[PDB]
């Protein structure tokens, strides 16, 4: 398309999910040249949807994959490769260098942001149209981070949530509103949310909704709802007792709309939700202590009701298999009356639970909604840690 995108539709009814994309990265990367990645996501241009992830500068099999448990180094880069290919050395494309990213297409071209540097002197440079436009230095000197899933734009404005400061406390979260890679405005986190990490966002009907991570005290997730037209936001938590961070305490009967739900402290996992009244689905790990399994539950009015319990559900990865990061994306340039809600799950593999190998890496499963009620299967990464020995 050659004109800015405007979020003029609402979600479609979510009555089950169907597979959209599957990688099989780690099973193929046992013999081919696949790159070690982590923090995946998916994002669509008007033209194509592509898988996106943070790379580690080595292939699974090469000797340099030893040590990729580590989150940030100067050999990480945000790459892109076609939907359902593995992230190969030969078909990947680097969008920028850094260890935390977000990227989105405003309708005319795309914004990609990589953050880089030492933990006390990190920088973000915002690439607009494969050229570096603006950069932002750190403001609280402690690991400036950002989304790890796509940003969303409305008429050229693309809000992006950044956090800088402790992960075990108060930190400094700001919402930036870029347009054509330039900073129109920015604001501090405002709302009842206590800490913000790795927001997963989608937009419909001119409003952007982000479901995030409270790493400091939450087991229920902060929601930030942004108005890209007035460039303002509010934050609250999901009211539902169906707790969705991980690790988590056991689900209560009454949740907490304005406060962290108490139980696990100083930990979390990136996660998403489609919050649309009765049409609300939530994703969560099946395990309470670990990144294993992944289910999607329909919990109507979960955002506002502190007694919301599931009414339909769907198993995406069995609890006997590993899951990991999850986030949302939508094909905004898909034809039709409404938007088809989609999500991805990161399937982490390697260190530290499967320490027999010295790499950590992952693969991708993505699903998108249907209105049919479709049968469910589960979707394992699939590799045998024993053939890499």
């Amino acid at each position, epitope marked *: 398309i050659r004109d800015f995108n405007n979020l003029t539709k609402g979600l479609c009814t979510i009555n089950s999910w169907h597979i959209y994309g599957k990688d099989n990265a780690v099973r193929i990367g046992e013999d081919s040249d696949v790159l070690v990645t982590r923090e995946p996501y998916v994002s669509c241009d008007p033209d194509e949807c592509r898988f996106y992830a943070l790379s580690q500068g080595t292939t699974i099999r090469g000797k340099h994959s030893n040590g990729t448990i580590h989150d940030r180094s100067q050999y990480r880069a945000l790459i892109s490769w076609p939907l359902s290919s593995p992230p190969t050395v030969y078909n990947s494309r680097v969008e920028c260098i850094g260890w935390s990213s977000t990227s989105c297409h405003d309708g005319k071209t795309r914004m990609s942001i990589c953050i880089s540097g030492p933990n006390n002197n990190a920088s973000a440079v915002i690439w607009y149209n494969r050229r570096p436009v603006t950069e932002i230095n750190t403001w609280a000197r402690n690991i400036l981070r950002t989304q790890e899933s796509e940003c969303v734009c409305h008429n050229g404005v693309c809000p992006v949530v950044f956090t800088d400061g402790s992960a075990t406390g108060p930190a400094e979260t700001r919402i930036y509103y870029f347009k054509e890679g330039k900073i129109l405005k920015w604001e501090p986190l405002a709302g009842t949310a206590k800490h913000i990490e790795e927001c997963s966002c989608y937009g419909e009907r001119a409003e952007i909704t982000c479901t995030c991570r409270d790493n400091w005290q939450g087991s229920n997730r902060p929601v930030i709802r942004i108005d890209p037209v007035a460039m303002t936001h509010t934050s609250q938590y999901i009211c539902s007792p169906v707790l969705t961070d991980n690790p988590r305490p056991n689900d209560p009967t009454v949740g907490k709309c304005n406060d962290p739900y108490p139980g696990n402290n100083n930990n979390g996992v990136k996660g998403f939700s489609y919050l649309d009244g009765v049409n609300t689905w939530l994703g969560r790990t*099946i*395990s309470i202590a670990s990144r*294993s399994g992944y289910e999607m539950l329909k919990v109507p009015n979960a955002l506002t009701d502190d007694k919301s319990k599931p009414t339909q559900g769907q198993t995406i990865v069995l609890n006997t298999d590993w899951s990991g990061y999850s986030g949302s994306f939508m094909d905004y340039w898909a034809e039709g009356e409404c938007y088809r809600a989609c999500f991805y799950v990161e399937l982490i593999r390697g260190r530290p*639970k499967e320490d027999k190998v010295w790499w950590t890496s992952n693969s991708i499963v993505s699903m998108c909604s249907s209105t049919e009620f479709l049968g469910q299967w589960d979707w394992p990464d699939g590799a045998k840690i024993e053939y890499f020995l």
Partner: nanobody, 120 residues
């Protein structure tokens, strides 16, 4: 709700084999694998391995790779421990524990124990 009820305690002379059952109740067998733990008379608690009640693949602790064999009557929600060529120092109590997650890092819900006394 969840009950893991184990077989009763056996006596076996050295060299014999034993099959200890663990019948699961209250959960869907298939989404939660089984931990087998040995609490030896003095020594305390030890992880013997975990069985993927979905695929059926067992992991053995290195101490247990060999004479020990995990299997399951899937169909009846039973997991079983089989210790072949019983050694006299295998007298102890074996617990099946449900593993909360993949690999069983958490044993929420343990069975009653089946105590073996290897003795001529």
């Amino acid at each position: 709700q969840i009950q893991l009820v184990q077989s009763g305690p056996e006596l076996k002379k050295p060299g014999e084999t034993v099959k200890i059952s663990c019948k699961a109740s209250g959960y869907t067998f298939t989404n939660y694998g089984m931990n087998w733990v040995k609490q030896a008379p003095g020594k305390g608690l030890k992880w013997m391995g975990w069985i993927n009640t979905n695929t059926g693949e067992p992991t053995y602790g290195e101490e247990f790779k060999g004479r020990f064999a995990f299997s399951l009557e899937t169909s009846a929600s039973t997991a079983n421990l089989q210790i072949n060529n019983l050694k006299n120092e295998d007298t102890a109590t074996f617990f099946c524990a449900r593993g909360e997650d993949n690999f069983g890092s958490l044993s929420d819900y343990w069975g009653q124990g089946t105590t073996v006394t290897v003795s001529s």
